[PDB]
Amino acid sequence: ATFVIDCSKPVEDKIMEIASLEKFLQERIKVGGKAGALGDSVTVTRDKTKITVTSDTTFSKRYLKYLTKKYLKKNNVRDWLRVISSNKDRNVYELRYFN
Amino acid sequence: KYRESKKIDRHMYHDMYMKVKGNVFKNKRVLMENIHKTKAEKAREKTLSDQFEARRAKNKASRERKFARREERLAQ
Amino acid sequence: TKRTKKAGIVGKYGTRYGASLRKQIKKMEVSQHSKYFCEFCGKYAVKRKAVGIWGCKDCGKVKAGGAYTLNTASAVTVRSTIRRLREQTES
RNA sequence: GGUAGUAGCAAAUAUUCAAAUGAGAACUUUGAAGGCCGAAGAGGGGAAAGGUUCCAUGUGAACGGCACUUGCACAUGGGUU
RNA sequence: GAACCGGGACGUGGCGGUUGACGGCAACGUUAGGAAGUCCGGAGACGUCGGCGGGGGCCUCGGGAAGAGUUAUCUUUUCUGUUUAACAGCCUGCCCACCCUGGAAACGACUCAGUCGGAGGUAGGGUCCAGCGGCUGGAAGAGCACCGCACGUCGCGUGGUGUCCGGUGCGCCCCCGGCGGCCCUUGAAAAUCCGGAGGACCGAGUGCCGUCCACGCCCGGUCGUACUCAUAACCGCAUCAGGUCUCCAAGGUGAACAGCCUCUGGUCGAUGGAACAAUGUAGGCAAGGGAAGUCGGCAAAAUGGAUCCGUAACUUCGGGAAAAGGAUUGGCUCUGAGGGCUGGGAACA
């Protein structure tokens, strides 16, 4: 299971730090009921505008959405951005403004 | 299921059925234990009887052979 | 276990109506709810449907009998008398 | 007429804040909050009975046992395939 | 948009003529497959109570995805929705009922309870019956949820993604099946529909006689239909705390449509403001005594659920009985017992 978080728009808007989100996901993602135990089973990789999460075992997109929402609340940008599933790709999320 | 698998015969099945209706057995485990104990006791009794009859027959044959030998000695 | 010393079927009435009436109705209660031998099919499967009506569960024959018993005592006497009269007439 | 501006308005837990309209707002409408009915209901339909009370717009007087901008009231229209 | 019913008239195709079909040992099956006076059966068609079983809806648990709520801290967590009508075909075949083979005591089969069997069980193989069962067409094009572009005054505009996979039950509402209990109580009729007994009568050779078969064609009158159904739309002289038949019925606690709290839906409608005198109305408490009060223990208080122990006289033997009289009850962490499916001593995994 591979999932991608798209933050290209906020990155271009200079309101998001891809490295910060990658660190948050690495520290908070739970493997076998324990947080931060990514190791070989779960791998989180970042890019210029996209974050990719891969796990050998089955993974839930909803958990990634919940972690991203927690990060947004922590960084005090939840009131401006929301996590929305992309129309075409079924394994990717996007951060977008709502107004 | 036991009757279908031939672990028990129809007669023992009927007896156990009547006893179950009689509230003899509280649960699965006690019924299984009782069935196993009855089968083991029956097998032990059967094998003991067979051994006793076999040894009796062997002793009778030996006695007959000895009697024939003594009769031959007497005939001389 | 012996549930009732002597009441038996009339125990449903509890302590009502008096001992004598309960004892008197015990006979009817037992007889009308009992099974009776079926002469036609040789089975104990005759049950009362309504007062005076007795049907067999096995062969399906229905007989008109006593209110609370399959055969009243006077029925046998009537049959014997009729048989005697018929034999006299035929002879 | 006196009684007399007196007897009374007291069952069914409960209202509050801001705004809008209006000559006039404790009582109309919007939003927020705090409560109640708690599925054998203060919810959602029928039978009988009623007969337009249904819906829209407007409103002098009367009535809605205080009040009303309001309405099961009044006036004009519409509605039951 | 997609179906059905009743009636009418024909045309095409199909079906029968061994004049009135074929198949199965049988239960019976197949879209068709004669027939008039006369006669016969069934459905309509029926009480009440108890257990059990099946189906539909609801409730409930888990996973996948979509959106939302919380996020000082924790929460792969909390909430919402994740749909499939009539009707047509095929499949399936509950509990019963029925048919074929066979002939049973060492009797067996069997229900929660029963019950069944030489008047033919068990067993093996079949037929039929219900379905608010399954699949497909209807039908995703619809509905719902989510994500976008556009007019931005009047396009009821335009596009995409999903609508997925399982568990569970003395759970609740409805329907059905099959047993059992009760009666000195046995718990409607008719319209209408279906089936059957009989066979008078009836036709031809390349056309005739029939045909409850399929498709095609036409028509379907009259009246009611708004609204309330009630703490103001009915009656009670009223917008009266009274009276007036019935359908639906979520979560928690709990035995429980008890009481108490909550969700959907509804609603804050009972003229308002200030004070907190006496006397009242409704609701509590009260030291010591404990009915001395009073006609009278009126009123109030006391008791109360569940589990365990225990329970007298008398008695119509059924009861009395929850007699009387005693003990326990929270929270937290554990232990033991009570099951289903699959796989050839399987007493196992």
Ligand SMILES: [K+]
């Ligand atoms: K005004």
Ligand SMILES: [K+]
């Ligand atoms: K009826």
Ligand SMILES: [K+]
């Ligand atoms: K009955």
Ligand SMILES: [K+]
């Ligand atoms: K229908």
Ligand SMILES: [K+]
């Ligand atoms: K006929």
Ligand SMILES: [K+]
């Ligand atoms: K109507």
Ligand SMILES: [K+]
């Ligand atoms: K009505």
Ligand SMILES: [K+]
């Ligand atoms: K006294």
Ligand SMILES: [K+]
């Ligand atoms: K006195």
Ligand SMILES: [Mg+2]
């Ligand atoms: Mg009810």
Ligand SMILES: [Mg+2]
């Ligand atoms: Mg109105």
Ligand SMILES: [Mg+2]
């Ligand atoms: Mg009863």
Ligand SMILES: [Mg+2]
């Ligand atoms: Mg439940």
Ligand SMILES: [Mg+2]
């Ligand atoms: Mg669609």
Ligand SMILES: [Mg+2]
């Ligand atoms: Mg005939």
Ligand SMILES: [Mg+2]
């Ligand atoms: Mg009048």
